[PDB]
Design an enzyme around this catalytic site. Structure first.
Site, PDB file in Angstrom:
ATOM      1  CG  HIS A 140      52.910  55.858  55.803  1.00 12.52           C
ATOM      2  ND1 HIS A 140      53.541  56.865  56.296  1.00 12.52           N
ATOM      3  CD2 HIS A 140      51.506  55.105  55.905  1.00 12.52           C
ATOM      4  CE1 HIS A 140      52.491  56.766  57.106  1.00 12.52           C
ATOM      5  NE2 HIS A 140      51.386  55.093  57.340  1.00 12.52           N
ATOM      6  NE  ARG A 162      63.437  46.680  56.483  1.00  8.04           N
ATOM      7  CZ  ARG A 162      63.159  45.692  56.922  1.00  8.04           C
ATOM      8  NH1 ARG A 162      62.820  45.427  57.872  1.00  8.04           N
ATOM      9  NH2 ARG A 162      63.040  44.286  55.703  1.00  8.04           N
ATOM     10  CE  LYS A 212      64.197  52.801  52.437  1.00 11.63           C
ATOM     11  NZ  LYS A 212      64.204  54.036  52.888  1.00 11.63           N
ATOM     12  CB  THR A 253      61.106  59.844  59.971  1.00 10.06           C
ATOM     13  OG1 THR A 253      61.693  58.394  59.939  1.00 10.06           O
ATOM     14  CG2 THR A 253      59.969  59.780  59.054  1.00 10.06           C
ATOM     15  CE  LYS A 282      63.536  57.989  63.452  1.00  7.33           C
ATOM     16  NZ  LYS A 282      64.105  56.222  62.988  1.00  7.33           N
TER      17      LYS A 282
HETATM   18  O1  LIG Z   1      56.005  57.525  56.844  1.00  8.58           O
HETATM   19  C1  LIG Z   1      56.523  57.548  57.485  1.00  8.58           C
HETATM   20  C2  LIG Z   1      57.911  56.770  56.281  1.00  8.58           C
HETATM   21  O2  LIG Z   1      56.708  55.773  55.882  1.00  8.58           O
HETATM   22  C3  LIG Z   1      57.856  54.772  55.060  1.00  8.58           C
HETATM   23  N1  LIG Z   1      56.710  53.236  54.680  1.00  8.58           N
HETATM   24  C4  LIG Z   1      56.676  52.697  55.156  1.00  8.58           C
HETATM   25  S1  LIG Z   1      58.163  51.811  56.016  1.00  8.58           S
HETATM   26  N2  LIG Z   1      56.324  51.485  54.669  1.00  8.58           N
HETATM   27  N3  LIG Z   1      56.083  50.068  54.857  1.00  8.58           N
HETATM   28  C5  LIG Z   1      55.540  49.469  54.123  1.00  8.58           C
HETATM   29  C6  LIG Z   1      55.226  48.009  54.588  1.00  8.58           C
HETATM   30  C7  LIG Z   1      54.453  47.286  53.706  1.00  8.58           C
HETATM   31  C8  LIG Z   1      53.973  45.375  54.165  1.00  8.58           C
HETATM   32  C9  LIG Z   1      55.156  45.214  54.952  1.00  8.58           C
HETATM   33  C10 LIG Z   1      56.111  45.947  55.935  1.00  8.58           C
HETATM   34  C11 LIG Z   1      56.685  46.720  55.717  1.00  8.58           C
HETATM   35  O3  LIG Z   1      57.393  47.874  55.952  1.00  8.58           O
HETATM   36  C12 LIG Z   1      58.149  55.413  54.041  1.00  8.58           C
HETATM   37  O4  LIG Z   1      58.965  54.533  52.934  1.00  8.58           O
HETATM   38  C13 LIG Z   1      58.823  56.871  54.302  1.00  8.58           C
HETATM   39  O5  LIG Z   1      59.606  57.225  53.452  1.00  8.58           O
HETATM   40  C14 LIG Z   1      58.081  57.128  55.645  1.00  8.58           C
HETATM   41  O6  LIG Z   1      58.858  58.042  56.294  1.00  8.58           O
END
Ligand SMILES: OC[C@H]1O[C@@H](NC(=S)N/N=C/c2ccccc2O)[C@H](O)[C@@H](O)[C@@H]1O
Ligand SMILES: OC[C@H]1O[C@@H](NC(=S)N/N=C/c2ccccc2O)[C@H](O)[C@@H](O)[C@@H]1O
Ligand SMILES: OC[C@H]1O[C@@H](NC(=S)N/N=C/c2ccccc2O)[C@H](O)[C@@H](O)[C@@H]1O
Ligand SMILES: OC[C@H]1O[C@@H](NC(=S)N/N=C/c2ccccc2O)[C@H](O)[C@@H](O)[C@@H]1O
Lengths: 810, 810
Positions: free
Chosen positions: A351, A543, A548, A650, A654
């Site tokens: 991701h 976030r 971003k 995502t 939406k």
């Molecule tokens: O595939 C679904 C989404 O995944 C998100 N990745 C995230 S939210 N990673 N989060 C990693 C994380 C790693 C440690 C602690 C809290 C966290 O939200 C991506 O940034 C986004 O582009 C994608 O649409």
């Protein structure tokens, strides 16, 4: 009232009413004279929940008799939001409950606002797991979500003096009516200890034991009578734990801290022991539960035919060495056979490509906490590197790049490398992201094992994200094309034949204005703020993170303000610019960005010359329930990440589904959206991935942009001199400094194209008819981005299972 | 089956059965194929609980409309035991539920064993509060029990190698079906801070806030349709508490530790800050709740006409300065008027004369934690001592003895003195105890204010302690005299006319043998121990403490063993000697006494020459549910505290009610029991209070007894030389040392009379007919010891309210 909300039959309405009163009386111990608004919510939740039980019991009984291949979706995050409305929608109960409560003298919408979000995730990754659960149920898959029952989810955000403050999300305070504790499945999870070698195998001894107690939450499919399970583990001390006496009992808190709180890091990585413990805890308990269900169906050869484990990022990567441990140490399988089983069982979804986010666990931590797992990882790595060495003889640098063990100041384990080695499938989450994986960060792995690498473009559930949050749009669509699109979203293509339809155009524009009035009202009541609902609703919600580029949005906003101040009596398309999102509490620059947004608002919103032409609002406490309100109200969706940095996104999907136009970069899923809708129906600007690469080779010099764009120079000077912070002239010096000297995300490089593209947005909004026709073209081609499509691809191409849209008997 | 258990009507049985299935399905989400034994218990508890709700809602509505004087029973302890059977008994549902579950293919007795005791107390004080609650409900009093919802109650005791081990009593692990959370009544409780003086009054500022969340438990009266409330406060952090981020959330545990665990001190006193916090927490939350209910009925003159607060020992003594604080600082009443109200509202019950048990809080602790309360206490003391000085001019030593503030190394507050000063009534708990209060420890206070001092002899509820635990005895009694005695226990006197009744004698003896066989069976299954059920069941069950003289019992046991070894072929009445009880974890001597009992057992139980003639069993984990099983089985009740040390005792009353004869000292309630039954029907031995005093004046020399009693000398020598601990010859040297040189409780002084009296017990047991006639005479005169009598006296003589035996409408 509206048809997609189902029937309000006389029998059902009567029956819901008596069950509501029965619960108010017997369950809540109240009558209509002393009942609080919360008692009423709880009575309604119990009444609705009752309708789940039959289907839930028979679904799970059905999986027992038919014994299909089971899908285990492992995630540290499930960002569920509220459950009441979703349950009614999927059970076709919404109109009936609305009638029942109305007749009882209660507003259901009001009761719905009482429910706390299950905020068990941070953002896109957590929400994706939730949409996936909904789709797996809707598609008749024998699927289980496994995670952790956090006592505290994502913090509630308060804005104090324009600064983010965090408050604990004590979401279980009043009890969760949607969970059923399963004490009979309480399982021991082991920590620390040491490894002993005996005549026949290694033994893990002298461990500390924490108990894992599961709570089951139902996941209803859309009107197919399927109810799947989400099982979340809670940490409990054993009773002899630390057993002067008073202290020993109080010290139980330490063991139970494992499931206490969700880490709010957002993307990046803190090598904290407690996080490691959470990761093992979910993995160890889940794997024992999987194996138990498998034995109750010796012959582990059939394990991969009856089990798939999906690893949602590297967070549950310890499933790979844990499965090996159970197979080798406990079941006494030989290594090679155990490894075969493991690889065929496990699949990995990435991701992110942001290097600071990647999990690289110090060896000394794993050594102390999980000694046997470290030995297994070392062995995995030795066997893998022998494979690399035979495939690429003499290539010594490939060996060190591909190693699971990273050398240096502190030795670390690269968990992403562990995941690829031990999985049969590795996927990215949008076509461009998956290409980047093969071409750059996992290039060596792609060359060794090309068959492992796949794409599964993300999606969202049209149940929560259209029917639930935007019933008015769902209805006007259902009037023309029927209701079958709700579980077959490609059918929205039929709306292309209505793009010139005068009645349909007027309806789409009406639904939007209605949603905007409703949201302009919500802003007034709950937050006492004034906005013009005839303005363009320009929203960026997600976030807060440098990649971003909320900052680029801020720059545009200031440009508009300066242009108005320059020529006050010139016509401008009025805008309400709404930016919302939480910042990771340890993320200083993100906290500064929030302060910047509020400070811009303070200046802009109280300038008499501006008037109702421009307003800048920070949306406090962005979360799933707020998304359901703001997204339907939006006209413009801001998706402006530096090309190559947003894996998919995502929120973009939406907004597309709900009638907003998109201004964005060719990044993540935006590329496939513009591809589906046509580029003429999308506001594309800025550098592509290749242009970013070209600039990186040359060296990004922000000064060059500052020197050549007078409008940008004025903004930077306003920021530097204290225009937006009169009492603290240097408040935003960290921001100016970063933009000028240390911007990884090239904010200035996309500025000119962004402003230009934004002018074109304003041009189109001046012509309502043509704005709305382009909107229809967006809604009409949004079908690909249903998580039903995404899940059908996982099922056929990774898990080896056929989805079914057939009903179970009611 | 048996009549006192109520009717099993066709309608009710049918209805209970369908409600059981409805709960199994809708509430527990199970069917008969996957339901665990615990699911079945929970289904039954929900089915029974449903029958409480109507009566509970109307009882509380009735108090609102009639507005009677409310009784608030404040206690840090409520030792409730199990709730399921008690609820069925009081609702007349027991036979119906037995039939319903039998027809469903389940044994109700088995389901009942699944329920955890609510172990929210240590011993007699906690259990008294529970019996009182039952009686207040049965007597139609508008009564509320207020305390703390401990997460962990009294520890479960395990015996490992003959030593007590403690394990956490995680009694809420699976959820408590008997509580209803009342979030709308969440109240702030303040700690620390400082006192500020302004123009008009003192202000308590800069405090830390902990929230108090109440949970309501129903307390049903015996078949009068009354359901009163027990309200227990739980500690919760506010959401901004400590709000790096992760630590702040984890640190919430600190605030919530207030309600985490019950202090197991037993009688004595540890000046621990956390205990002080618990005491204030229950007091502060309860008083706000009382005042709120009072206002919802400015005119605090009527406060004492509408409120009584009973202080159960000094544990909630802070109610006195807290009431003053609210009245003076918040309501702005003048001191003298506030004080008038307080004294007329509050009453104090003392439960001990053991000096080491008395609460004397260091001033520096109250200074830091409760600064405004300290100032109020100082003022109370100054005004009180001026009263003393005017009544006894020149008596300077009386002033220092009567002071609430004790001088010395560390200044302390005598909480007992605080209670007497600020209460209109002070009572002891048995006639001899109340006399001792007036004559010795509170003598100065009695001389100043003689009208304050009362007696309220303790009692037990004949519902739990006869009908529930001994249905077979309740039935044979009901066959002759009807059922009205269950709520009018004096009616048992009618049994005196059956003392020569051949049929009745045989029935009483039968019921006992039946109870003994059942308990001999329970010992076999759950603990794999062999006992002769034809032996005399000699039982001492109660907390372990030197004053209770389990040690004297041990000495008797060893004497019997030595006598058997001396003359093996002589006839002795076979005995099974059962001793049980928990020791306070910090109480070394009590832990040694437990080890002694088990070590004696190890020697005695495996001596081939002894055979089935003598067995010594330690009853592990003595608690309310075990009492309900062992007491009905007992033949002999050991109540052998040194005269003057057991305030009342209540276990004594439970044994009397259930057909055991009593061997005891003239101490506590034993005096009134022997008085009711006649001394000829009681085995009285040993020193009276006056003889103990005489010996204290002379000086107690244990050597004298050792020198003059050869049988005692042999025992001490056996103990010293390692007869009872061959591998650890000196194991019991602490015990020998204390008995010989530092025995506060004069074990040797009562030894000869005890052994002699025990021989007379054996003599009577050899004649079953005459044993049983004496038993009838005990049961027949046990009526005074009903807590209905006790509560009727509190109500008329302290609270100023009339009890009512009239039914509420069903
Ligand atoms: O595939 C679904 C989404 O995944 C998100 N990745 C995230 S939210 N990673 N989060 C990693 C994380 C790693 C440690 C602690 C809290 C966290 O939200 C991506 O940034 C986004 O582009 C994608 O649409
Ligand atoms: O009401 C608050 C309590 O509810 C219980 N849930 C019970 S006893 N039954 N739940 C049944 C159920 C039935 C259908 C769908 C979801 C469900 O949780 C939960 O086990 C407990 O954790 C929670 O605090
Ligand atoms: O079932 C487990 C949960 O039950 C809830 N109780 C509810 S929702 N209703 N209780 C109703 C009730 C009805 C009659 C008598 C006693 C009662 O607690 C309690 O509020 C909660 O603390 C507990 O964990
Ligand atoms: O009136 C009821 C009973 O009260 C008991 N007193 C007790 S159990 N005091 N307990 C005091 C105590 C004090 C601190 C911590 C735990 C505790 O059980 C008396 O010892 C007993 O004679 C009497 O029958």
């Amino acid at each position: 009232q509206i048809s997609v909300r189902g029937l309000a039959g006389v029998e059902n309405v009567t029956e819901l009413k008596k069950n509501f009163n029965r619960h108010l009386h017997f369950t809540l111990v109240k009558d209509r004279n002393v009942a609080t608004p919360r008692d009423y919510y709880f009575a309604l939740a119990h009444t609705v929940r009752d309708h789940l039980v039959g289907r839930w019991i028979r679904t799970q009984q059905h999986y027992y008799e038919k014994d299909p291949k089971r899908i285990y979706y492992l995630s540290l995050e499930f960002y569920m939001g509220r459950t009441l409305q979703n349950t009614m929608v999927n059970l076709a109960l919404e109109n009936a409950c609305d009638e029942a409560t109305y007749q009882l003298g209660l507003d259901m919408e009001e009761l719905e606002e009482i429910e706390e979000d299950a905020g068990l995730g941070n953002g896109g990754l957590g929400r994706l797991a939730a949409c996936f659960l909904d789709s797996m149920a809707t598609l008749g898959l024998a699927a289980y979500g496994y995670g952790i029952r956090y006592e505290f989810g994502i913090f509630n955000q308060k804005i104090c003096g324009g600064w983010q403050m965090e408050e604990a999300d004590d979401w279980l305070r009043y009890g969760n009516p949607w969970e059923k504790a399963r004490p009979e499945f309480t399982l021991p999870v082991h920590f620390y200890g040491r490894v002993e070698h005996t005549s026949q195998g290694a033994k893990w001894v002298d461990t500390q034991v924490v108990l894992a107690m599961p709570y089951d939450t139902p996941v209803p499919g859309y009107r197919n009578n399927v109810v799947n399970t989400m099982r979340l583990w809670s940490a409990k001390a054993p009773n002899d734990f630390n057993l002067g006496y008073i202290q020993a009992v109080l010290d139980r808190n330490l063991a139970e801290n494992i499931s206490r709180v969700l880490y709010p890091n957002d993307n990046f990585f803190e090598g904290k022991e407690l996080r490691l413990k959470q990761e093992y805890f979910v993995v160890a308990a889940t794997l024992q539960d999987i194996i138990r269900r498998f034995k109750s169906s010796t012959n582990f050869d059939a394990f991969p035919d009856k089990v798939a484990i999906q690893l949602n990022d590297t967070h549950p990567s310890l499933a790979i060495p844990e499965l090996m441990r159970v197979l080798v140490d406990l079941e006494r399988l030989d290594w090679d056979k155990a490894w075969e089983v493991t690889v065929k069982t496990c699949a990995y979804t990435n991701h992110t490509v942001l290097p600071e986010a990647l999990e690289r666990w110090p060896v000394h931590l794993l050594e102390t906490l999980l000694p046997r797992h470290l030995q297994i990882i070392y062995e995995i790595n030795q066997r893998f590197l022998n494979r690399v060495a035979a495939a690429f003889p003499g290539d010594v640098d490939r060996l060190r790049r591909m190693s699971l063990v990273e050398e240096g100041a502190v030795k670390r384990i690269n968990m992403a490398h562990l995941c690829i080695a031990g999985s049969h499938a590795v996927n990215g989450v949008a076509r461009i992201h998956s290409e980047i994986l093969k071409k750059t960060i996992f290039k060596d792995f792609y060359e060794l094992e090309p068959h492992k690498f796949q794409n599964k473009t993300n999606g969202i559930t049209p149940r929560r994200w259209l029917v639930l949050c935007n019933p008015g749009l769902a209805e006007i669509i259902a009037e023309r094309i029927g209701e079958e699109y709700i579980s077959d979203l490609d059918q929205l293509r039929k709306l292309l034949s209505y793009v010139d339809d005068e009645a349909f155009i007027r309806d789409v524009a009406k639904v939007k204005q209605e949603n905007k009035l409703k949201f302009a009202a919500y802003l007034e009541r709950e937050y006492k703020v004034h906005i013009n609902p005839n303005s363009l609703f320009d929203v960026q919600v997600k976030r807060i993170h440098e990649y971003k580029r909320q900052l680029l949005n801020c720059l545009h906003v200031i440009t508009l303000y300066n242009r108005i101040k320059k020529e006050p009596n010139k016509f401008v398309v009025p805008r309400t610019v709404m930016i919302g999102g939480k910042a990771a509490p340890g993320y200083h620059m993100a906290k500064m960005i929030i302060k910047l947004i509020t400070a811009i608002g303070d200046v802009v919103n109280h300038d008499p010359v501006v008037g109702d032409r421009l307003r800048v609002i920070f949306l406090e406490n962005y979360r799933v329930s707020l998304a359901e309100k703001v997204i339907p109200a939006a006209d413009l969706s801001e998706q402006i990440s530096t090309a190559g940095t947003e894996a998919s996104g995502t929120g973009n999907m939406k907004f597309m589904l709900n009638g907003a136009l998109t201004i964005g970069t060719m990044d993540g899923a935006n590329v496939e959206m513009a591809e589906e809708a046509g580029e003429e129906n999308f506001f594309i600007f800025g550098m592509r991935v290749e242009d970013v690469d070209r600039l990186d080779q040359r060296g990004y010099n922000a000064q060059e942009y500052y020197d050549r764009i007078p409008e940008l120079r004025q903004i930077i000077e306003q920021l530097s001199s204290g225009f937006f912070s009169p009492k603290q002239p240097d408040l935003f010096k960290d921001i100016v400094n970063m933009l000028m000297h240390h911007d990884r995300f090239k904010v200035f490089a996309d500025y000119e194209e962004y402003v230009k593209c934004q002018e074109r947005v304003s041009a189109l909004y001046k012509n309502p008819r043509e704005w709305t026709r382009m909107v229809i073209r967006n809604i009409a081609t949004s079908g690909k981005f249903s998580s039903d499509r995404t899940i059908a691809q996982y099922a056929r191409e990774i898990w080896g299972v056929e989805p079914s849209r057939q009903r179970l008997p009611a």
